[PDB]
Scaffold this active site. Sequence first.
Site, PDB file in Angstrom:
ATOM      1  N   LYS A 118      -8.003  13.154  17.009  1.00  0.00           N
ATOM      2  CA  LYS A 118      -6.530  12.293  17.113  1.00  0.00           C
ATOM      3  C   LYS A 118      -5.769  13.463  16.672  1.00  0.00           C
ATOM      4  CE  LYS A 118      -9.393   9.707  17.390  1.00  0.00           C
ATOM      5  NZ  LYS A 118     -10.658   8.655  18.097  1.00  0.00           N
ATOM      6  N   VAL A 124     -14.174  12.132   7.196  1.00  0.00           N
ATOM      7  CA  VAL A 124     -13.772  12.526   8.600  1.00  0.00           C
ATOM      8  C   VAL A 124     -14.450  13.195   9.367  1.00  0.00           C
ATOM      9  CG1 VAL A 124     -12.251  14.457   6.950  1.00  0.00           C
ATOM     10  CG2 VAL A 124     -12.541  14.534   9.553  1.00  0.00           C
ATOM     11  N   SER A 152       9.360  -4.608 -12.454  1.00  0.00           N
ATOM     12  CA  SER A 152       9.905  -3.734 -12.547  1.00  0.00           C
ATOM     13  C   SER A 152      10.976  -3.870 -13.643  1.00  0.00           C
ATOM     14  CB  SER A 152      10.469  -2.828 -11.138  1.00  0.00           C
ATOM     15  OG  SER A 152      11.264  -4.679 -10.817  1.00  0.00           O
ATOM     16  N   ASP A 196      10.720 -10.279  -6.627  1.00  0.00           N
ATOM     17  CA  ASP A 196      10.115 -11.369  -7.252  1.00  0.00           C
ATOM     18  C   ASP A 196       9.999 -12.194  -8.819  1.00  0.00           C
ATOM     19  OD1 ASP A 196       7.425  -9.994  -7.465  1.00  0.00           O
ATOM     20  OD2 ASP A 196       7.390 -10.661  -4.956  1.00  0.00           O
ATOM     21  N   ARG A 202      16.074  -8.982  -0.743  1.00  0.00           N
ATOM     22  CA  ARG A 202      16.132  -7.934  -2.306  1.00  0.00           C
ATOM     23  C   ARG A 202      16.489  -8.226  -3.159  1.00  0.00           C
ATOM     24  NH1 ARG A 202      10.865  -5.006  -3.457  1.00  0.00           N
ATOM     25  NH2 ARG A 202      12.545  -4.693  -5.164  1.00  0.00           N
ATOM     26  N   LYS A 208     -12.200  17.188  10.176  1.00  0.00           N
ATOM     27  CA  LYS A 208     -13.707  16.970  10.463  1.00  0.00           C
ATOM     28  C   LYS A 208     -14.611  17.741   8.634  1.00  0.00           C
ATOM     29  CE  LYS A 208     -17.303  17.728  14.034  1.00  0.00           C
ATOM     30  NZ  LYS A 208     -17.916  17.583  12.917  1.00  0.00           N
TER      31      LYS A 208
HETATM   32 ZN   LIG Z   1       5.252 -12.329  -8.425  1.00  0.00          ZN
END
Ligand SMILES: [Zn+2]
Length: 327
Positions: free
Chosen positions: A64, A57, A172, A182, A141, A52
């Site tokens: 919680k 917060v 990547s 993709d 993948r 907190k």
């Molecule tokens: Zn893409």
Amino acid sequence: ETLNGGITDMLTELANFEKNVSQAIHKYNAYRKAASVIAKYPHKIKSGAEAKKLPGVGTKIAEKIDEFLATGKLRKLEKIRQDDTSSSINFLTRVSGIGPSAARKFVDEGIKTLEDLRKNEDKLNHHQRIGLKYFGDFEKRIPREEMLQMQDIVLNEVKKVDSEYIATVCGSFRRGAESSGDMDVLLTHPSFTSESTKQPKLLHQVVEQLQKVHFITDTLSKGETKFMGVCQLPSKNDEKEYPHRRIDIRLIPKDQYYCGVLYFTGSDIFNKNMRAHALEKGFTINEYTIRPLGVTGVAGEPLPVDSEKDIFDYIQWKYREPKDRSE
DNA sequence: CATCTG
DNA sequence: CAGATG
Ligand SMILES: [Zn+2]
Ligand code: NA
Ligand code: NA
Ligand SMILES: [Zn+2]
């Protein structure tokens, strides 16, 4: 990073639900900072009272965290994890074309599953339909071995379509990854730039070939610059057909590629770092360019770039092979 | 962000 | 045109 993990993790849990399930953009938004703040916070969060303390917060969340601390679970989170209606959403969302908005709908229409989909194949939109059709492949993948195969083919026709084209598969895949989600290909032409007025064909041009030759099977969105589609490596000697993988072609001004090419390659973190130091050497860089920072607080002016080498050079830095571009 | 849907 | 998705 492991010191206030689960807490961050549940906050995240809470955040996504509120947003996608109900429409708690705010609460959602709340979950987020919170999870972001405890994220950096260097100490062992032994209490909500201690939480907190934190900014972002407050009152609710601490309730919680405490429960989670006190006991090993969140009742509301537990209570959320079971609800079918929640679950359906997160599930439908899994489709290419199904955002939480459409998720929410169908559910309230009874459509709650994959079969449901097929049944009510009418209520789906085009994109929405392809995502269904390729539901599984789409979740598959992309292993490098396939990537280079693809990459190869792409490059050969972009070549044929016109020798002046400068295609480039980023990601990547470029970062040297073993598997990519993709195929995200970069595209430019000499004859395309900053000021140079339009020239849609520059894109549509290629979009054909790839189709012409079966590389591309379905279009998901096709415009003057961006093309969101589906492609497929011709299943070799019949007994094995590849999957349908997602692809994206985007036509960019020759005058602002390497900034983009650079940019898109990642990793985010590499970016950030190069972006901070950039700021150091007296500049700024963005998804399109690199420019001179005037002391006045700030200032414009585009620096000219013929390569990733130009950019690096600028902020005076070690040219980093894309392999060593992670962080 | 650019695209499509309605 | 907002509004959705990616
Ligand atoms: Zn893409
Ligand atoms: Na989705
Ligand atoms: Na509004
Ligand atoms: Zn501590």
